[PDB]
Each structure stands twice: as structure tokens, then as C-alpha cells.
């Protein structure tokens, strides 16, 4: 009557009280209590003695980091690292992103991962890196994703002088990816080549959504709407064609000052060639917000003359042949990823603290 409606809420995996969330709620509770200090309270000690045994079983059964073998580390970021991994049981290969709980609490920002998870879990988009499994332990959050063995576009740009044909393609794929993120009612903000990866067939998918909300690449307005992503597309196209970013400076303060002054501070080096159409398009993205391209939807971008080739159409671009198909030795060839160089947890508390509380609901099995 009501109890149908209730059982609906428990079965919906978008709901914050799905079964995974409720078990997080239990494991989180136990972890924030099981310290010999807090077991001085009888209420706690009783409760813990009951659930002690069952929770230790649950942990065995739930997905955990010991289910995977780490092959190589392939990424490092603010709050953790990205690992190439093999699921021991299934033998399949994934990319797994880790996030230190200690660090996220300590340094202010510990909400970003919700949208990141949801985007990757639920986009059904071939422009988004799909999330398969999210889970957690005492120390870390984990996100198991489809590995993208073609690497980022920094790694592409460093290894190729990039012709205009290639840039038409990679740009077009970006404008499509963003339109999808926009269709989901999100602004990326931090659009850049490090957040642009290449699949087994050298086609684009986006990853790292830490910034999605409901320096060189940043827009003036940021220093407020979706148009700021489209700025960053202009900057990208420029870096591909020219070689440097269009507001490069020695200092960061220099870069900022240049971005503000963009009306004056943008000229195109005469030693690099670039078409009129391509010049025009970059300038159309690098205006003030009020008359920037992509305010009035995606379609005005799509019909811009620059994008005319006799190679692909907008509806079929991702199903055409990519510029650079990677050649890969095995299911673990991380040749398009540079190697990586090289931990403090919470204090044992005296009273109750609730460190695990902002991570209840994270766990997701697809």
C-alpha cells in the first residue's frame, strides 16, 4: 500500500537508501565506533558485540581491493592515484581510481566524488568513461572504470605535430562530449587535454569529473554558465594547432593577466600556419561570455564552416576511423602512459568522530 512504495526506494540504485547504501551505513557506523576507547560506553559495546561477527563476514563477501591485482600505477592526482588492475577471479582488466579518505577530510573538499561517480555510472554515453564498480574500505574510495589504453591528449600532442584534419576530428568529438555533459544538466568547468582520453580505437572519452557541478584553460568569467566550457575548447584547438597555449606565461599571475586582457593578448604566431576558418572559430570561442559561441546551443558550433570535411558527419563521427589508432601488445599495454614516482591515516579518537559519514552511499555494483 505504502510498503510497495518503500520497497521501490530500496530497489532504485539512484536512491540514497539502496541496499548498498544501507550496508555502507552499517560498516561506517561500526568503523567510527570500534575503538577500545568508545567501547567504555555499554550501548556501543553491546551493539558491536552483536554485529562484530556479521560485519566481518560481509567484508569477506563485498567487493574489496584484494579482489584485484595491481599491474602498474598510471596516474597520480590531488587525493590519490589511478591503477591498472586485473580482477583476480574474472581476469578482466580495468582502470581503478583511488581516493584517500584522510586527505579529502583534511583538505576541505569531500563532495566532488558524488557527481563523478554518478556521471560515470549513469551517462550511458560513449563519450564518458563508464564506471562498473564503486566500493570502499577503512582508508580509500575506489572507482573501477573501463581502461583507456590510448592515453590522454597531452601524451598525444607531445608525440605528434598535429595537423588541422586531426584537430577538426578531436575537437568535434569534444564538442559532442560536452554537449552530452550539458544534456545531463552539468557544467564541466575544468575542460582540458589531461581530462580527455582515448579508447582501444583512438576515439575520445572524458574522465576526471572532480570539477563538474550541477589555469591556461580557464575562462575570464570563472576568475555563471556552460559557455565557460566552450572557452576551454577554443584554448584546446589552439594548443593542438599552434603548439603552445594561447595565454602562456612564466608566472601564473602572467597567464591570469593575459586571459583578462584576451581582446589584446591573443595573436597567432606567424611561424605556425592555420586556416581562416580555424582562426575564426578560435576567436568565436575566445570572446566575452555574452557573445561567445555555444551560448545559443550546440548547433551554431556544429554548422561552423571549419568542421566541413568529406571524412565524417556529426551523427556518425565516433563510428569512423580515428586519426591515431593505438597499436597495443597485450591487454595491459600502458605504453601511452608515462611511469610514476612515489601515507597518513586518522588519529584513533578519544570520543566519537564520524569520519566515515560523508562516504555512506558511495558503494555501487553495476
Ligand X SMILES: COc1cccc([C@@H](C)NC(=O)N2CCC(c3ccncc3)CC2)c1
Contact map string, positions 19 to 58, toward its own copies, x by CB under 8 A: x--xx-xx--x---x-------xxxx-xx--xx--x--xx
Q: Which of 33, 38, 55, 74 binds ligand X (CB under 6 A)?
A: 74
Q: Identify the active-site residue in 190, 199, 216, 229.
A: 190
Q: Could you tell me the CA-to-CA distances from 255 to 102, 169, 288 in Å, in that order?
A: 33, 28, 17
Which of the choices its own copies, ligand X, none does residue 144 contact, using the CB cut-off of 5 to 8 A by kind?
none
Q: What's the residue count for the chain?
A: 366
Q: What is the DSSP letter of 141?
A: E
Residue 274 touches its own copies, criterion: CB under 8 A = no
Q: Which does 147 bind (CB under 5 to 8 A by kind): its own copies, ligand X, none?
A: ligand X
Distances (CA, A) of 60 to 109, 120, 207, 275: 31, 26, 30, 60
Question: Is residue 6 close enough to count as binding its own copies by CB under 8 A?
Answer: yes
List the x/- string, 78-97, binding to its own copies by CB under 8 A. -----------x--------
What is the strand order of the sheet 196-198 is part of? 151-152, 196-198, 204-206
Q: Which of residues 130-159 bind ligand X (CB under 6 A)?
A: 145, 147-148
Partner from ligand X, its own copies, none contacting 280, C-beta within 5 to 8 A by type: none
Closest by CA position to 179, among listed 120, 226, 118: 226
Closest CA to 189 of 212, 214, 221: 212
190 is catalytic: yes
**Under 8 Å between Cβ of 95 and 148:** yes
d(CA 288, CA 69): 49
Q: Count of residues binding its own copies (CB under 8 A)?
A: 45
Q: Which residue in the set 100, 155, 255, 355 belongs to the binding site for its own copies (CB under 8 A)?
A: 355
Closer residue to ligand X, CB minimum distance, 197 or 281: 197
Sign, CA dihedral 172-177-180-186, equals negative
Could you list the residues known to form a binding site for ATP, using ranges: 74-82, 97
User: Which of 30, 55, 95, 180 contacts ligand X by CB under 6 A?
Assistant: 95
Helix/strand/coil percentages in the chain, nearest 5:
40, 15, 45
Determine which helix (DSSP H) or strand (DSSP E) holds 134, and give its type and residue range.
strand 131-136
Q: Looking at the annotation, which residues are catalytic? A: 190
Site residues for ligand X per CB under 6 A: 74-75, 77-82, 95, 97, 99, 129, 145, 147-148, 197, 207-208, 210
Amino acid at each position: 500500500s505504502r510498503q510497495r512504495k518503500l520497497e521501490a526506494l530500496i530497489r532504485d540504485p539512484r536512491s540514497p537508501i539502496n541496499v548498498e547504501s544501507l550496508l555502507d551505513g552499517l560498516n561506517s557506523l561500526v568503523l567510527d565506533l570500534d575503538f577500545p576507547a568508545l567501547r567504555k560506553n555499554k550501548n556501543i559495546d553491546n551493539f558491536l558485540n552483536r554485529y562484530e561477527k556479521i560485519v566481518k563476514k560481509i567484508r569477506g563477501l563485498q567487493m574489496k581491493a584484494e579482489d584485484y591485482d595491481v599491474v602498474k600505477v598510471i596516474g597520480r592526482g590531488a587525493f590519490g592515484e589511478v591503477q591498472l588492475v586485473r580482477h583476480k577471479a574474472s581476469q578482466k582488466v580495468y582502470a581503478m581510481k583511488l581516493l584517500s579518505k584522510f586527505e579529502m577530510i583534511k583538505r576541505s573538499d569531500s563532495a566532488f566524488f558524488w557527481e563523478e561517480r554518478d556521471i560515470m555510472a549513469f551517462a550511458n554515453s560513449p563519450w564518458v568513461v563508464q564506471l562498473f564498480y564503486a566500493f570502499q574500505d577503512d582508508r580509500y574510495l575506489y572507482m573501477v572504470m573501463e581502461y583507456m589504453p590510448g592515453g590522454d591528449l597531452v601524451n598525444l600532442m607531445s608525440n605528434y605535430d598535429v595537423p588541422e584534419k586531426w584537430a577538426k576530428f578531436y575537437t568535434a568529438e569534444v564538442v559532442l562530449a560536452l554537449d552530452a555533459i550539458h544534456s545531463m544538466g552539468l557544467i564541466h568547468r575544468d575542460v582540458k587535454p589531461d581530462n580527455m582520453l582515448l579508447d582501444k580505437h583512438g576515439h575520445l572519452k572524458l574522465a576526471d569529473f572532480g570539477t563538474c557541478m550541477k589555469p591556461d584553460y580557464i575562462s575570464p568569467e570563472v576568475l555563471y554558465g556552460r559557455e565557460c566550457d566552450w572557452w576551454s575548447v577554443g584554448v584546446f584547438l589552439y594548443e593542438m594547432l599552434v603548439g603552445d597555449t594561447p595565454f602562456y606565461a612564466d608566472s601564473l599571475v602572467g597567464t591570469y593577466s593575459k586571459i583578462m586582457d584576451h581582446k589584446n593578448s591573443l595573436c597567432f604566431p606567424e611561424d605556425a600556419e592555420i586556416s581562416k576558418h580555424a582562426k575564426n572559430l578560435i576567436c568565436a570561442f575566445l570572446t566575452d561570455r555574452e557573445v561567445r559561441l555555444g551560448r545559443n546551443g550546440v548547433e551554431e558550433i556544429r554548422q561552423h564552416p571549419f568542421f566541413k570535411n568529406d571524412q565524417w558527419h556529426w551523427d556518425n563521427i565516433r563510428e569512423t576511423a580515428a586519426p591515431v589508432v593505438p597499436e597495443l601488445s597485450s591487454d595491459i599495454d600502458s605504453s601511452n602512459f608515462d611511469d610514476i614516482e612515489d601515507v597518513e591515516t586518522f588519529p584513533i579518537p578519544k570520543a566519537f568522530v564520524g569520519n566515515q559519514l560523508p562516504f555512506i552511499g558511495f558503494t555501487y555494483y553495476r
